[PDB]
From a paper:
Antigen presentation by major histocompatibility class I (MHC I) molecules is central to adaptive immunity. MHC I molecules bind peptides and present them at the cell surface to specific receptors on CD8+ T cells. MHC I molecules bind peptides in a groove that is lined with discrete pockets (A to F). The stability of MHC class I molecules is highly dependent on interaction with a bound peptide ligand.
A close examination of how the FV 20mer peptide binds in the A pocket shows that the main-chain nitrogen of P1 Phe is rotated in a position that is normally occupied by a canonical P1 side chain, as seen in FA and FV 8mers. In this configuration, the P1 main-chain nitrogen forms a hydrogen bond with Asn63, and the extension residues P-1 Ala and P-2 Arg protrude out of the A pocket. Interestingly, the main-chain carbonyl oxygens of P-1 and P-2 residues form hydrogen bonds with the indole nitrogen of Trp167, which likely stabilizes the peptide backbone as it exits out of the groove. The structure also shows that the bulky P1 Phe side chain cannot occupy the canonical position of the N-terminal amino group, i.e., the cavity formed by Tyr7 and Tyr1711, and the phenyl ring points toward the α1-helix. Finally, the main-chain carbonyl oxygen of P1 Phe forms hydrogen bonds with Tyr7 and Tyr159. Specifically, the FA 20mer structure lacks 6 residues from Gln54 to Tyr59, and FV 20mer structure lacks as many as 18 residues from Ser42 to Tyr59 - electron densities at an acceptable 1σ threshold were not visible for these residues in our structures. In the FV 20mer structure, however, because P2 carries a larger Val side chain, the P1 main-chain carbonyl group cannot similarly rotate toward the α1-helix and consequently the P1 phenyl ring is positioned further away from Ile52. In the FV 20mer structure, however, the P1 phenyl ring is oriented differently and, as such, it cannot engage with Ile52 thus causing residues Ser42 to Glu53 to become disordered. In the FV 20mer structure, however, similar molecular cross-talks between the A and B pockets were not possible because of the larger peptide P2 Val side chain in the B pocket that positioned P1 Phe side chain further away from Ile52. As a result, a significantly longer stretch of residues became disordered in the FV 20mer structure, generating a widely open-ended A pocket.
Residue numbers in the entry:
A (entry chain A): 1 to 41, 60 to 275
B (entry chain B): 1 to 99
C (entry chain C): 0 to 9
The structure:
């Protein structure tokens, strides 16, 4: 399959409660492989996390000034970076982007050479990073180091990271009244998290009438999802649930009973 | 600006009365990241509940999984209680083995 | 060699 390495970093100020917390979590696909938390009680990687803590604190101080903000409030800087590769291990694309207080701030474009800034504050960052040739350093990491490490981790972890576990599926039925019942189509035990779960009525998608819960972790590496439709009593066999997942040898068509 | 949490409460494995399992409360879609999550057994806070490392989706919204060992029975009620800056009062979602 | 990326201050 295709694979991703991605870091999810959160820095959050907390005036009067010490310096901003920094947490960095790294993933290969839906599997966490590292965490660094500045609040938690190999040397070269730890050193880069510790320096990154300081860098994100610098960032938060600069951002407060770019938006004329008071020293009283808490603010959040998030970052996502890493690489996507195909089944052959070749680079598909790199990522390096930021959000401040939940709003997109700046992103490295797909070219790995230029920046997209959301506002006049992010333009300041953009000019600074252009002056310091930051993109060239990010590009070297994303094309070089990130792709090489992801290929090594995939090979070393091939029995889990390269194994797709199909969903275990069933349909449940619950009357809501004399006139209507819920049909719920379940997918349990799958990995990776990407899945398509849909209801059809007479072979027409029921997007508007389907309740689809967010895919959710089970805690054993696997994921769960369901999709429900309310159907008239007696009409259950007109409804089909369709399941697509990388671990299935073929897509599933399920009905009640 | 602020996004209120989505909450799901569910078991790791299919629920069987008298068989040991894990009770999960998955909170997602929220911003900012500070959040308080308790798991409840017959209305009482369960002690030593663990949680995942803070992460977020590609839309920047945070998610956490809170979890504990539990042995479901016919009698015992389980729930998850969540507070966030977006909520005027803690939100309780009851464990239903069909959701 | 390192798997973590060096970050730059915004």
């Amino acid at each position: 399959g295709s694979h991703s390495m991605r870091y999810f970093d959160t820095a959050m100020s907390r005036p009067g409660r010490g310096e901003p917390r920094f947490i960095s979590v790294g993933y290969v696909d839906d599997t966490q492989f590292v965490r660094f938390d500045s609040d938690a009680a190999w040397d070269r990687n730890t050193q880069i996390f510790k320096t990154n803590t300081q860098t994100d604190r610098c960032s938060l101080r600069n951002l407060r000034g770019y938006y004329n903000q008071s020293e009283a409030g808490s603010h959040t800087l998030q970052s996502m970076y890493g690489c996507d590769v195909g089944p052959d291990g070749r680079l598909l694309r790199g990522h390096n982007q930021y959000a401040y207080d939940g709003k997109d701030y700046i992103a490295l474009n797909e070219d790995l050479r230029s920046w997209t800034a959301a506002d006049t504050a992010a333009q300041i960052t953009q000019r600074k990073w252009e002056a310091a040739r930051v993109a060239e350093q990010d590009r070297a990491y994303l094309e070089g180091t990130c792709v090489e490490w992801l290929r090594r981790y995939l090979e070393n972890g091939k029995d889990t990271l390269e194994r797709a576990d199909p969903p275990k599926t069933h349909v449940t039925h619950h009357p809501i009244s004399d006139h209507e019942a819920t049909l719920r189509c379940w997918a349990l035990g799958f990995y990776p998290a990407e899945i398509t779960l849909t209801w059809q009525r007479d072979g027409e998608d029921q997007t508007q009438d389907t309740e689809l819960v967010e895919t959710r972790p089970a805690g054993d590496r696997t994921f769960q999802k369901w999709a429900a439709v309310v159907v008239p009593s007696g009409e259950e066999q007109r409804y089909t649930c369709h399941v697509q997942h990388e671990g299935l040898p073929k897509p599933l068509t399920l009905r009640w009973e | 600006i602020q996004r209120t949490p989505k909450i799901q409460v569910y078991s790791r494995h299919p629920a069987e009365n008298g068989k040991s399992n894990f009770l999960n409360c998955y909170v997602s879609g929220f911003h900012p990241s500070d959040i308080e999550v308790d798991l409840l057994k017959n209305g009482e806070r369960i002690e030593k509940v663990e949680h995942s490392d803070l992460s977020f989706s590609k839309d920047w919204s945070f998610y956490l999984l809170y979890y504990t060992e539990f042995t479901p029975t016919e009698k015992d009620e389980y729930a998850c209680r969540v507070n966030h800056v977006t909520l005027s009062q803690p939100k309780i979602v009851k464990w239903d083995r069909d959701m | 060699r390192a798997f973590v990326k060096k970050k730059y201050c915004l």
